[PDB]
Amino acid sequence: RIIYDRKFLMECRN
Amino acid sequence: EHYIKHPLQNRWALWFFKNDKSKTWQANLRLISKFDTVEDFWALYNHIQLSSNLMPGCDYSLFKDGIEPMWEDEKNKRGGRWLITLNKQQRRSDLDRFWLETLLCLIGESFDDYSDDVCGAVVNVRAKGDKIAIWTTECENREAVTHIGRVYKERLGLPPKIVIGYQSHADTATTKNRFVV
Numbered sequence: 789r790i791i792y793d794r795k796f797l798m799e800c801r802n
Numbered sequence: 803e804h805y806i807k808h809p810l811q812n813r814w815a816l817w818f819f820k821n822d823k824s825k826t827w828q829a830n831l832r833l834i835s836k837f838d839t840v841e842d843f844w845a846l847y848n849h850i851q852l853s854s855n856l857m858p859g860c861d862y863s864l865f866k867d868g869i870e871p872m873w874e875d876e877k878n879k880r881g882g883r884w885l886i887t888l889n890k891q892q893r894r895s896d897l898d899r900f901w902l903e904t905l906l907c908l909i910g911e912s913f914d915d916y917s918d919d920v921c922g923a924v925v926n927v928r929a930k931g932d933k934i935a936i937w938t939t940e941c942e943n944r945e946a947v948t949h950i951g952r953v954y955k956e957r958l959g960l961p962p963k964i965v966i967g968y969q970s971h972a973d974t975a976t977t978k979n980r981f982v983v
């Protein structure tokens with residue numbers, strides 16, 4: 789299962 | 803890892819709804835774009851209007867590819883939604899925040915084994931009061947629906963005072979809460 793933290797996804801925004 | 807995009811568990815499809823009373827509800831639903839990586843999600847989100855900036859009567863819907871954002875879908879017609887009801891002051895403080903948070907819960911697969919019970923989510927921009935909702939596949943799955951609501955409410959950071967309802971689409975298409983959290 790592929791799961792991402794909120795923190796990882798926000799760090800990707802730019 | 804230097805060059806490969808970060809894949810999501812699912813391909814997701816973003817839809818836009820604009821009310822045109824001369825058309826069937828369904829024909830007002832238009833596909834924006836699909837994406838299956840973290841990077842591609844941000845490329846899409848970063849170039850589109852914030853919900854608080856849409857005309858009243860518009861929706862955004864993010865659903866798993868193959869599941870239409872309508873209660874007629876095989877995967878929706880037995881289900882229901884966890885519903886967040888906003889007043890007009892929360893459009894300012896909460897709407898855009900709450901919605902981004904909802905997408906991150908979908909794409910990042912935030913509900914353990916019950917993320918498979920998630921179909922998608924919709925934001926309704928309305929003059930009378932905005933709404934955000936997560937749709938799940940089976941209103942009967944007490945543990946699935948119940949787990950999703952608990953984690954969703956935590957994720958939105960809503961206080962014990964706020965109580966949110968889950969309504970089956972069967973009830974809606976005819977609204978009482980099967981569950982609250």
Ligand SMILES: Nc1nc2c(c(=O)[nH]1)[n+](Cc1ccccc1)cn2[C@@H]1O[C@H](COP(=O)(O)O)[C@@H](O)[C@H]1O
Pocket residue numbers: 827871872873874883926971974
């Ligand atoms: N056939 C069909 N019609 C839908 C649908 C839908 O999935 N299928 N929806 C979306 C919907 C799906 C689940 C729960 C509430 C609303 C709204 N509508 C129509 O929009 C009206 C306003 O719904 P709203 O989208 O503003 O919540 C509703 O009474 C229906 O006539």
